């Protein structure tokens, strides 16, 4: 699909409130295209038509829009246009989408500002009631290690930072299975210890605000010694049962840039769909997701994971902006996959067919991830914009 | 929002603004304020751009300090200004200078001076800490931009510090359209930086 909207026959500008159609074609007018288009606010539709393309081979076409609703309240208004050709030819069906693409329109960012959760602590742990809510932090490890809705338990494993992709094909850079490339990222990365790297405590106190709990923890991981990543994170649940997780993380500029900057952890919770906001219906990466939209998408659990025959890490969804499964929600920018394949059994799987559905469902929320190359994959082709190198990275999620 | 709060070795502040103009709100931000124990101030900023604006020319704070000195001293990027979209020529070091040379006297006065990448800054007893641009000066943004010749410059009360998270590129391809890459404008929505003054 990357493909088709990279090749697609029809190019778009946008200037305010008219659309420019280009044709690519060379010999035929667009004499089976239909073109719609749609405003949406954060996956809400408000407005859209239907205007007859009419434009020669390599002409151009105006179209204006007409007065756009102009919402109250507040989010990011998006333009989505798509080509549709009403009637079958001898290679398509009737509806077939040649083209498409989306564009942000005006943004309303929000200023509308929105009992006390108790903090029991321990000496093993930190735990946070609020209602039948709570959470509790393991004061060894420092990681959030079970949370409970009534008497239900939903983490199986606990919610620790993760830096490593199960390697892709592209990442692991072998054309003739008798050479190995040193240069390549899966022999750098696994050189460097990141498949290895243990996290040392630095830092796990809590605090009680005015109106919420406070948990502060600091991680350094580490192989032989040298410091690869550290990872400080502040625990903030409020009174409205929300978790805001802020995680600022450094990276040691001699090692080579991690795969990915997130979170990871098994959800107790299997269940059918998955609904988000952000990013395209199919798999998206930060190298590759133009053919992909911003809407409110809503697909079964099965179609978060692309079955590649050799697997890999997969089912990246970028852009997203909040995602919903089961009882819980995640909020904020970050990039996600969710599936019954841990990474680890990814990575120590050489066929699709081996693989087994564990226990839960894992979840890898990603602030950053690296781009997956592609130019060849023989060598490292991933671009030097694509590479998670800015040694410094921040970001912030809020679950419930 | 404004609120003040006691933890177990220090107060935090937390407080939001939104920048509005004609009832648009072009930039929030949210600001911690954390003040330990040992007499350091921990700030943590983040800004969010509405993205139909025009991207902002710089994500910073500035203030007028009180104290004149003599000497610069910092730890970052070149002894010479530079700026995101040219900073080549320069390279960290721990420089020292004295105050007249971290202003550039252009005829047509503009924001100038900046010094980009900069870990450590020092100016009498202040010391800033983090990952930033800065300028430092006795001229206020707001009298650059309304001075059109230098010679009329008159030095400010105290000293103008503008400590940037975030800078724009200058351009320079060409003077009389818009000239900066799209890799050097603040086009991320969503930004974030942390400086500790002690």
């Given at each position: 699909?990357?493909?088709?909207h990279?090749?697609?026959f029809?190019?778009?500008?946008?200037?305010?409130?008219?659309?420019?159609?280009?044709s690519?074609?060379?010999?035929?007018?667009?004499?089976?295209?239909?073109?719609?288009?749609?405003?949406?606010?954060?996956?809400?539709?408000?407005?859209?038509?239907?205007?007859?393309?009419?434009?020669?081979?390599q002409?151009?076409?105006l179209?204006?829009?007409?007065?756009?609703?102009?919402?109250?309240?507040?989010?990011?208004?998006?333009?989505?246009?798509?080509?549709?050709?009403?009637?079958?030819?001898?290679w398509?069906?009737?509806?077939?989408?040649?083209?498409?693409?989306?564009?942000?329109?005006?943004?309303?960012?929000?200023?509308?500002?929105?009992?006390?959760?108790?903090?029991?602590?321990?000496?093993?742990?930190?735990?946070?009631?609020?209602?039948?809510?709570?959470?509790?932090?393991?004061?060894?490890?420092?990681?959030?290690?079970?949370?409970?809705?009534?008497?239900?338990?939903?983490?199986?494993?606990?919610?620790?930072?993760?830096?490593?992709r199960?390697?892709?094909?592209?990442?692991?850079?072998?054309?003739?299975?008798?050479?190995?490339?040193?240069?390549?990222?899966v022999?750098?990365?696994?050189?460097?210890?990141?498949?290895?790297?243990?996290?040392?405590?630095?830092?796990?106190?809590?605090?009680?605000?005015?109106?919420?709990?406070?948990?502060?923890?600091?991680?350094?991981?580490?192989?032989?010694?040298?410091?690869?990543?550290?990872?400080?994170?502040?625990?903030?649940?409020?009174?409205?049962?929300?978790?805001?997780?802020?995680?600022?993380?450094?990276?040691?500029?001699?090692?080579?840039?991690?795969?990915?900057?997130?979170?990871?952890?098994?959800?107790?919770?299997?269940?059918?769909?998955?609904?988000?906001?952000?990013?395209?219906?199919?798999?998206?990466?930060?190298?590759?997701?133009?053919?992909?939209?911003?809407?409110?998408?809503?697909?079964?659990?099965?179609?978060?994971?692309?079955?590649?025959?050799?697997?890999?890490?997969?089912?990246?969804?970028?852009?997203?902006?909040?995602?919903?499964?089961?009882?819980?929600?995640?909020?904020?920018?970050?990039?996600?996959?969710?599936?019954r394949?841990?990474?680890?059994?990814?990575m120590?799987?050489?066929?699709?067919?081996?693989?087994?559905?564990?226990?839960?469902?894992?979840?890898?929320?990603?602030?950053?991830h690296?781009?997956?190359?592609?130019?060849?994959?023989?060598?490292?082709?991933?671009?030097?914009?694509?590479?998670?190198?800015?040694?410094?990275?921040?970001?912030?999620?809020?679950?419930?």
């Amino acid at each position: 699909t990357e493909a088709k909207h990279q090749q697609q026959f029809f190019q778009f500008r946008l200037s305010g409130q008219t659309i420019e159609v280009t044709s690519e074609y060379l010999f035929r007018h667009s004499d089976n295209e239909l073109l719609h288009w749609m405003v949406a606010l954060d996956g809400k539709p408000l407005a859209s038509g239907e205007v007859p393309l009419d434009v020669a081979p390599q002409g151009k076409q105006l179209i204006e829009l007409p007065e756009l609703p102009q919402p109250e309240s507040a989010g990011q208004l998006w333009l989505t246009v798509r080509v549709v050709q009403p009637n079958a030819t001898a290679w398509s069906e009737a509806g077939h989408i040649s083209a498409w693409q989306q564009w942000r329109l005006a943004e309303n960012l929000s200023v509308t500002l929105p009992a006390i959760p108790h903090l029991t602590t321990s000496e093993m742990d930190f735990c946070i009631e609020l209602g039948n809510k709570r959470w509790q932090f393991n004061r060894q490890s420092g990681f959030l290690s079970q949370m409970w809705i009534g008497d239900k338990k939903q983490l199986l494993t606990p919610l620790r930072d993760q830096f490593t992709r199960a390697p892709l094909d592209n990442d692991i850079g072998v054309s003739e299975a008798t050479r190995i490339d040193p240069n390549a990222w899966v022999e750098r990365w696994k050189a460097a210890g990141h498949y290895q790297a243990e996290a040392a405590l630095l830092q796990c106190t809590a605090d009680t605000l005015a109106d919420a709990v406070l948990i502060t923890t600091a991680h350094a991981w580490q192989h032989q010694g040298k410091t690869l990543f550290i990872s400080r994170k502040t625990y903030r649940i409020d009174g409205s049962g929300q978790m805001a997780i802020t995680v600022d993380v450094e990276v040691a500029s001699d090692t080579p840039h991690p795969a990915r900057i997130g979170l990871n952890c098994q959800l107790a919770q299997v269940a059918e769909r998955v609904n988000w906001l952000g990013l395209g219906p199919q798999e998206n990466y930060p190298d590759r997701l133009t053919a992909a939209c911003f809407d409110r998408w809503d697909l079964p659990l099965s179609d978060m994971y692309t079955p590649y025959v050799f697997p890999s890490e997969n089912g990246l969804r970028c852009g997203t902006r909040e995602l919903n499964y089961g009882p819980h929600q995640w909020r904020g920018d970050f990039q996600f996959n969710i599936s019954r394949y841990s990474q680890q059994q990814l990575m120590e799987t050489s066929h699709r067919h081996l693989l087994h559905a564990e226990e839960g469902t894992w979840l890898n929320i990603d602030g950053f991830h690296m781009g997956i190359g592609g130019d060849d994959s023989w060598s490292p082709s991933v671009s030097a914009e694509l590479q998670l190198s800015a040694g410094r990275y921040h970001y912030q999620l809020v679950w419930c």
